Design a protein around this nucleic acid. Structure first.
Lengths: 94, 110, 71, 67
RNA sequence: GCCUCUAAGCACAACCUGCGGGAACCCGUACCGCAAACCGACACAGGUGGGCGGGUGCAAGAGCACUCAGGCGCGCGGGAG
RNA sequence: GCGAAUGCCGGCAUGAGUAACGAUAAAGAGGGUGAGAAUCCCUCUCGCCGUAAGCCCAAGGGUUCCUACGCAAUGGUCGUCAGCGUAGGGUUAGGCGGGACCUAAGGUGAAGCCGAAAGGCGUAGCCGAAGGGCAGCCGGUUAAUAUUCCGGCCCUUCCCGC
RNA sequence: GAGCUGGGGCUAGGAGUGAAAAGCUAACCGAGCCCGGAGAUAGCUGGUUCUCCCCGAAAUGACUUUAGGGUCAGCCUCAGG
RNA sequence: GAGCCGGUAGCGGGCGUGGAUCCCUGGAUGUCCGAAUGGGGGAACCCGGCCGGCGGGAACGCCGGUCACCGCGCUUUUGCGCGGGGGGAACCUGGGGAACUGAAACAUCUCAGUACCCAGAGGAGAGGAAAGAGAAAUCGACUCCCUGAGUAGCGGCGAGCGAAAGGGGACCAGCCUAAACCGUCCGGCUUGUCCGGGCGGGGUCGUGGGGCCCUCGGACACCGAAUCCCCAGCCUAGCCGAAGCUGUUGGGAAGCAGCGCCAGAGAGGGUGAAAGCCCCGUAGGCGAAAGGUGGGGGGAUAGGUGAGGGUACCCGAGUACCCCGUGGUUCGUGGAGCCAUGGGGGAAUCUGGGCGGACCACCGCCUAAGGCUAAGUACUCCGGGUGACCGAUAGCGCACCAGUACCGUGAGGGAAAGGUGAAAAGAACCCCGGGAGGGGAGUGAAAUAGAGCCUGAAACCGUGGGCUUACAAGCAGUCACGGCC
């Protein structure tokens, strides 16, 4: 309770280009306030929170032998930089 | 054959079997006594995978089932297992004692 | 509840009927009237000390009000 | 790491505070890892979580003792 | 919202007004969607709300006949008849 | 202990390989891909819509949409096609909408009037609407979403100050 | 025009409504649908099961809100004398 | 006691005899909904006001601690501090309370105070020390069982319905408060001498209590948890624990056979086909803990009980009682009693007053119009065990991803499917093929044991073989006979 962390980067393709020049996209604690995004963002990666937007998605179509389901809840949020800093290794990475 | 058991890694005899030739009990569960005596398996003529040689057929088959194995063997083979008399300050020593004896002392051998 | 009495309980039941008589007169009982009903008292009041009420119910009332009249 | 049980015993307010916080961050590191080293990681994840968990068990014990 | 006075502060730091600076979160879009995805237990010709409804001709016109864009060819085929 | 009760439950028969394919808005070719293509893909002839078989917002559906593999089930046979199966990715908005505001009918309901009990009635304040009110538009970019993204242009209130 | 229509509501099922025929009241409400009394009640129909041995009914009397029912009489079977 | 990262075994990585898996008892956050209560709201999601915090400060926004309502008593101030509510299969008390069907109609009647709506206390409540019984100069709380008669009786006396004291049994504490009188006291009004409310002695058990006079009196009684300490019964973990091998037919043996064996423990299951001596911490007996629960046995804690006569009396209920309007009860209207209440009347302090006999004269009875609770019959969610109780269409419907699929608007209805084998060794590999699937090799004791795969029959359709069939009228058949095989 108060363990700041609240996310998992958007290893997502399309989301790549943004990482590429100025914005970055990730999966975030389905719940964090957008200002929550700004803070986790800022103190976490020592940056400059710019433009913080959000989207959400649940799962559809998972057949399980004799019964079925479709998954849980994956949350999406995108935040941009001010200069183009931080996330380096992550980005060079994927 | 329950939450409780017989010998462990131990080294014992096969009565009603096909081998009798006792030896290293590589592993023995808690509930299904499931124990492998490394005394009779097969090949599972493997996947056809490169998992086993790209030209496979697994070798060491050894899941030991039946429980007619005569666990424990001191200078004596088929014997049940005693319990204790403690003898020393804080002494469980549920070692195995009957006729000959074996307790699997933490030394020279299991 | 919201209409029993105030000075005890007088709020309930009643099974009854009739038909007709003519017994130790000339015969048996013209017997029958399988009926059901209510059955109760009335309301009224006085004053604590400048500004009041009572509410209550009938008799129990009269004696009572007399009582707290005593105070 | 019963030993860690010990360190635990050892620290207090702001201490345990930033300890568990930073450690937590560490596990974040893990979260990140969700697609790199991985193999020997496993444990950093499960255990690390158990660890920090303890961290909290303690804070509770101590400040609870308090108020 | 424009005013229009108490409370009562205001009135020296309340409101009206410029410039600078800084802020602004929660849930929402995909696509189907006069219809094989919405309602009739079916890829059931039934019903289901508002937006000009392109054009030619016809006295007038969302009716008429051919069409603009845009949409099809209904989903079991061939065959003598 | 059982034909037997138009029995009860589950099989399996029967007209039947006849009746039927969901609209008389027609289709014919060439090449292509394929284990196989009337029934998929391009392209070329051709008919029927067009005032709809248009697009559009909304509703309601809630997967799916896409991209990639696959078809034994499913389409009323096809089927290398799919809204089918498997996996992965896909919608983000101070200014669009709704709440962060308003309220009627209307529900609630502190008061109050009221019932054998459970309730009946109910001002006030509240909840409660494509009825009120409010600050942006257009051109460009994705397999895929847009006045939400990018860009050009035009603002919105609230906070700190001056 | 007592016009038609989307959205939001209240009246309801021995009650509703109801330009009222007995209409409609989640696809056949002349008194809704689910669960419950309950396995209502059923002199009416159905159905009413191994072998073999003996006997062998009546299908009429009498009164009955009974009259295709029933109490007693008539005929039957097993047992005693 | 030495192995585990739940049902997944697979991948990819691990912790542990410096008690790791895990069995138990108490621990910690303990998301959002749900009584919800800070507010709203189509619950499980959107709002807000106070102190703390961090960040880009203010605005933003999270952790956080935060803030219904109720009635309840207290500091009635400015009120701070308590209670409930919300459940629950059945049992349970009271609240309200129905047709069928019977009475072969059916209106009294009947099912019945039954079904059901409700409110509510529990772990069990219910009732529970007599204005009782009953008539013997008798009993003695209440509750539940057997009996009491299905008589005594209630009634279109019809269908029907139907007691109670006693006796046998079980379980056996009894205890209390306003009850003006005492005095005390504070408030009173208004002052003297009334009421009001606190302490008491009184605080009626089968009848006194108080106040005056005298005999009085100087250690055994515990509660309904008064209360506390214990062997706390268990909770779930514990522990031991009886005796055979050789052979042998078998894929097997625990089986046939040989000899040797146990037994305060031949209950059963489990170990490749049927073991006392093989598996089982069982019957044998014993075991055990610092938590969560108490009856016992005993203690202490023990509120409070526990004397005698005398005397003018004042001291358990606001309605007893009587008229009608009604409930109970074996009572359905009646000669109809007692308790019980809706109307109007409308009082007695132990010469008191209801009760036995409608009522009157008697004797007798009990002591009313307040309070408390144990113990013996009920009930079944949940645990344990046993079954001339069931085998997968019976059993709970439900034997295991059935109260879910799926129909209905909601209410609500409400399936099916158990087994491959002994163990996975469950199918490398070769061959037709797009695939499935098909022939081989290996499996093996079998694979006509092959994955819906045990036993696997009837029905129906199929491949081959025997007899049979184109002048035939018949459920069927079937008696006969003749031709085939």
């Amino acid at each position: 309770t108060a363990y700041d962390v609240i996310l998992a980067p958007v290893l997502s393709e399309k989301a790549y280009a943004g990482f590429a020049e100025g914005k970055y996209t990730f999966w975030v604690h389905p719940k964090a306030t957008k200002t929550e995004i700004k803070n986790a963002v800022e103190t976490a990666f020592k940056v400059k929170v710019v433009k913080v937007n959000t989207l959400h998605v649940r799962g559809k179509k998972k057949r399980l032998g004799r019964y079925l389901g479709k998954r849980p809840d994956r949350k999406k949020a995108i935040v941009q930089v001010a200069p183009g800093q931080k996330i380096e290794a992550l980005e060079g990475l994927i | 054959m329950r939450v409780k058991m017989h010998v462990k890694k131990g080294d014992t005899v096969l009565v009603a079997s096909g081998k009798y030739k006792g030896r290293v009990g590589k592993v023995k569960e808690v509930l299904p006594k499931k124990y492998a005596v490394i005394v009779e398996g097969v090949n599972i003529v493997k996947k056809a995978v490169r998992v086993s040689p790209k030209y496979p057929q697994g070798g060491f088959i050894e899941k030991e089932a039946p429980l007619h194995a005569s666990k424990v063997r001191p200078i004596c083979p088929a014997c049940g297992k005693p319990t204790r008399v403690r003898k020393k300050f804080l002494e469980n020593g549920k070692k195995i004692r009957v006729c000959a004896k074996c307790g699997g002392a933490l030394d020279t051998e299991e | 509840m919201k209409e029993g009495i105030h000075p005890k309980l007088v709020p309930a039941r009643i099974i009854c009927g009739c038909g007709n008589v003519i017994e130790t007169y000339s015969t048996k009982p013209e017997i029958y009237v399988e009926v059901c009903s209510k059955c109760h008292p009335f309301y009224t009041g006085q004053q604590r000390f400048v500004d009041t009420e009572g509410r209550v119910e009938r008799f129990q009332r009269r004696y009572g009000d007399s009582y707290r009249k005593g105070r | 790491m019963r030993k860690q049980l010990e360190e635990a015993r050892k620290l207090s307010p702001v201490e345990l505070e930033k300890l568990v916080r930073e450690k937590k961050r560490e596990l974040m590191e893990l979260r990140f890892q969700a697609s790199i080293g991985q193999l020997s990681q496993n444990h950093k994840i499960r255990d690390l979580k158990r660890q920090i968990a303890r961290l909290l068990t303690v804070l509770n014990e101590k400040r609870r003792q308090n108020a």
